[PDB]
């Protein structure tokens, strides 16, 4: 199928970069794969609207067309990013802000939202340094993107994979987490 990897990290020799390689290398050659490196793209995450440039027409903003086109083309989205302050890094938050706009990703109905990206699925791979037991007692940590961003847009299902205590553990342990990510990627 058509696969869009949206990758978020400033350092090309990061552990998250390593996670990107695992996915790319283990994705079947039957898939058609494009990677969107937000940092390398120099993506501008700051959403702007006014009376001059109306919110209503955010769906037709020229600079964002390439990214709208990438999302519409994809059948399965894979997000790779570290948890910064319980959440997506700013560049990735703004990818959503700017690209997932009304009349493109969803529309307003009588009561709530109507999703428009149906037929689409996603996989979220997050890294962070919070222990696994602590996780029921925390806000977001990938759950906002999954539960309150991708789902409302009709994208289903969404698998959320957290690699936890990621700095406290050993290289050895991180290699094992890399192996499982490769494994999971293989069985898609």
Ligand X SMILES: Cc1cc2nc3c(=O)[nH]c(=O)nc-3n(C[C@H](O)[C@H](O)[C@H](O)COP(=O)(O)OP(=O)(O)OC[C@H]3O[C@@H](n4cnc5c(N)ncnc54)[C@H](O)[C@@H]3O)c2cc1C
Ligand Y SMILES: CC1=CC(=O)c2ccccc2C1=O
Binding residues (CB under 6 A) for ligand X: these are 9, 11, 14-16, 18, 47, 55, 82-86, 97, 127-130, 166-167, 171, 174-175
Partner from ligand X, ligand Y, its own copies, none contacting 113, C-beta within 5 to 8 A by type: ligand Y
Q: 110 exposed, middle or buried (CB, 10 Å; 0-12, 13-18, 19+)? A: exposed
Residues 8-37 binding its own copies (CB under 8 A) are: 10-13
Q: Does 165 bind ligand Y (CB under 6 A)?
A: no
Q: Residue 147 touches which of ligand Y, its own copies, ligand X, none (CB < 5 to 8 A by kind)?
A: its own copies
Specify burial of residue 114 (Cβ count, 10 A radius: 0-12, 13-18, 19+): middle
The helix/strand count (H/E) of the chain reads as 5, 7
Quote the least distance from Cβ 138 to ligand Y, whole Å.
9
Q: Is 171 annotated in some ligand binding site?
A: yes
Chain positions 109 to 138 lying near ligand Y, rule: CB under 6 A, are: 113, 129-130
Q: Please, which of residues 57-86 interact with its own copies by CB under 8 A?
A: 84-86
Cis peptide before 157 (omega within 30 of 0): yes
The 8-class DSSP code of residue 14 comes to S
Query: Which residues are CB-contacts of 107 (< 8 A; sequence separation ≥ 6)?
Result: 113, 114, 116
131 binds, among ligand Y, ligand X, its own copies, none (CB under 5 to 8 A by kind): none
Residue 107 interacting with ligand Y (CB under 6 A): no
Which tokens sit at 95? Answer: 């990818």
Residues 6+ apart with CB under 8 A from 19: 80, 125, 127, 163, 178, 181
**Taking the complex as a whole, how short is the minimal distance between the CB of residue 86 and ligand X, in angstroms?**
4
Is 83 annotated as a binding-site member? Answer: yes
Q: How far is it between the farthest Cα atoms of the chain?
A: 55
Selected range binding its own copies among 7-15, 28-36, 61-69, 180-188, rule: CB under 8 A: 7-15
Q: Which residues are annotated as a binding site for FAD?
A: 9, 15-16, 18, 55, 83, 85-86, 127, 129-130, 141, 167, 171, 175
């Amino acid at each position: 199928m058509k696969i869009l990897i949206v990758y978020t990290h400033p350092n090309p020799t990061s552990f998250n970069a390593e996670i990107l390689k695992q996915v790319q290398t283990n994705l079947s050659k039957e898939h058609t794969v494009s990677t969107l490196d937000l940092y390398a793209e120099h993506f501008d995450p700051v959403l702007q609207f006014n009376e001059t440039h109306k919110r209503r027409d955010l769906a037709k903003v020229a600079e964002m067309e390439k990214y709208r086109d990438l999302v519409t083309w994809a059948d399965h989205l894979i997000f790779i990013f570290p948890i910064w302050w319980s959440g997506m890094p700013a560049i990735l938050k703004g990818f959503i802000d700017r690209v997932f706009v009304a009349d493109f990703a969803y529309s307003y109905k009588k009561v709530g939202l109507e999703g428009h990206l149906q037929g689409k699925s996603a996989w979220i791979i997050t890294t962070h340094n919070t222990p696994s037991f602590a996780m029921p007692f925390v806000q977001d940590y990938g759950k906002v993107l999954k539960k309150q961003i991708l789902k409302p847009c009709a994208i289903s299902p969404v698998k959320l994979t957290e690699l936890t205590s990621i700095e406290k553990i050993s290289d050895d342990e991180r290699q094992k987490l890399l192996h499982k990510v490769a494994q999971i990627t293989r069985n898609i």
